[PDB]
Amino acid sequence: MVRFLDGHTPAYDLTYNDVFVVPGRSDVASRFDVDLSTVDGSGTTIPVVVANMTAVAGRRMAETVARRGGIVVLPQDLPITAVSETVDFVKSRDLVVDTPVTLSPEDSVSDANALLHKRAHGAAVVVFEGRPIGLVTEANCAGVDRFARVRDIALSDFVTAPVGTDPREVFDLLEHAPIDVAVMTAPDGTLAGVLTRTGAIRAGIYTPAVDAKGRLRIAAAVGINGDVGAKAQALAEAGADLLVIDTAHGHQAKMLDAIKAVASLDLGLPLVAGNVVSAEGTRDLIEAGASIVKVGVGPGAMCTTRMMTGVGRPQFSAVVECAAAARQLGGHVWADGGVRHPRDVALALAAGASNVMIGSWFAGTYESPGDLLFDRDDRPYKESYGMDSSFDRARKGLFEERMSLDPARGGVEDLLDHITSGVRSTCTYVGAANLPELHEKVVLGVQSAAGFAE
Template identity: 50%
Template structure:
């Protein structure tokens, strides 16, 4: 054997142990291993080819492994942990189990939902069969999974939980259901309602809505369910972060009127654990409101009392002296409100907030700006005028999370129906149990729109999207004012008078002016 042959033999061997085999044995073992491991031939086929028994083929293959002539490497994508996956499957008797590695960078050991979602999308494509009913619960990984789906057999897709948007690329569980149904070509049954609700009565009312009830009918028919279970820790669990106080409850404010047994209702709400109690009526500066505040204050509530609505300093003074902690400001600015057109009563919102906030400060109290918010600028102006909070209604009505069924117009645009609480529609709902005379009498006092379409902005269809936009506007306002806090923003704000022409000048142009 010359030197070149020696080099060839050495090249074929994977280690010194393999050199203990003779040259012919090495060549034969290498050939058999190639047939078996690379070409997929059976031991019987190999035995027939080389003129030996299948038992000898088995011994040669075993020797090739022992002497390092053949190395078997099981290579799976770096993000999959095959060993743990198999151990998990065996431990719990699962049909399938896939463990996904989430390489930590530095000390951050948080999981990577996007990476997990991509693997889950591939797994779901394997598991779902034609005709299945696929249920999707909320979860960041679930949403990323839906975004990564590129194949899915025809199936019906139903949402298993209410809406919660945590700022993912795909907008929440509703969009996850829509995406999965789009890929599969099947029906979609989303749930247009929040994941967490303040009480069982609200949940029961939402369940009775047509679209939600239809989704619930599919729950018993679900054949494949995709759920996400995470850690119950701050900063990791998005549901945990939705809760605010030490008991893990949501902060809840509830309102009573100034007629009927409002004191009894207020006591029930306080006993139920509300965090803020609102005494609410359209015209807050009246004797009945003052008497109502005093009566509720006599219950010695350990939570703030909010009262309104008013638009003048005198009203602020009287309601605070009666026992209110926070004054709600605004008569007529709301998008659903027709008070100013029906009665001529009201006041421009900025002027009202500016005057009322200045008066409330004298008593160490606060005001909320209620109504008229259509753009981020309106929030910034209310805060600049001295409001400690800004209430938003109609703007948020055009979102996935608002109550009501999602509808489509003739052009396919999504919208929610909204109506004022003093409208004929609302009055009819409230007085349905009263006599015909009382219903007719109360129907005369209509100060609100009975139906209005609040279209969802395709780029900002969720509440969080709008909040992000508002915060961006307010932050920019603070930057322009040179303010590092909202208190400093109010202090540095300069109030002037702007003409209609000046306001029009500041509006963006979406087309050329020529």
């Protein structure tokens, strides 16, 4: 249970704006003494899960996050081929070493210039017969004509070390380097991947998320429509480390049948069920065989679900209630309320959630599926696309209803530094050495609306 200050007993449900964490006595020295590992069987070393939105979760996303301890859920109704290709792709990559943008000398500049923003490295590797011949920057593509081959503008001067080199060392070697990128080579000199000054420090801090075999973890999603038993079967055998059943209203007959369908197959994987804000719904979903319940519906007062239907629940209260009902049944809770700030993640955890799912916040990064554009003011933003009877399509569609990028820190690895830094500080304030202790030792209070006045 979560403690509230004596006397604080609202006649209303609480949002993240309604509450505050009171610091207690703390024996925790520094943030680095905090274990952010999750016990929910997701195998994540940080309480961060990326949403099954098409705009957020691509190949590059799943890779980058898992390396740093998180996990990414792949969108439902995605072609099974594309899925299996992505799983094998990610599960095959290096734990400490990233995957740079590769360029053949035959490619154009417009290809080179557009591919540079697809990773946070700030440089592209030109590859010949599987060996690095040099690097490409935005500075190099500046004045060059769009259709010129990249062989002309390539800068062949860069730093190199063998794969498996001690990261502490790799940072010192990159110190005076004009480019922040270090190209990592296999024993035979072929390209392993790259590493940066900060990207090196990450390995020292973030523990990667791996499966039984030591491959980076990844997850995928499925709707309640069509054959649920079939899709879950296909997705599981494609190497998925976790499954997610997702729908708008998670407490409904079709969902309960769907969980039963997947539970019967006994795939031996953690199973996550759709969205509910109530304890009743949390029990009904776990009883149908879900291991983990994801919670949010209409969490914001002015959000589109709420303004349309009047339906929803304040997120703090919703997570607090559902997480408690889950612990009784020996299960866990995911917070699916949209999170734009680190305190959203910290509070979600303090309320008893084991993990927090992050949405379109992450669409504003290099690693998201969309292409990077620029507005009239030349500010960066990423843009993507959300794409059987002709008459029915119009009939169903009758009732049926980009994000800015931070120029300073544009990589998702930076957003995670921001998130984990805050959550680590939260733990030091309450005196917890980890997420289970956070839920135990946390003390909260209620504040009024008056504090938000100006």
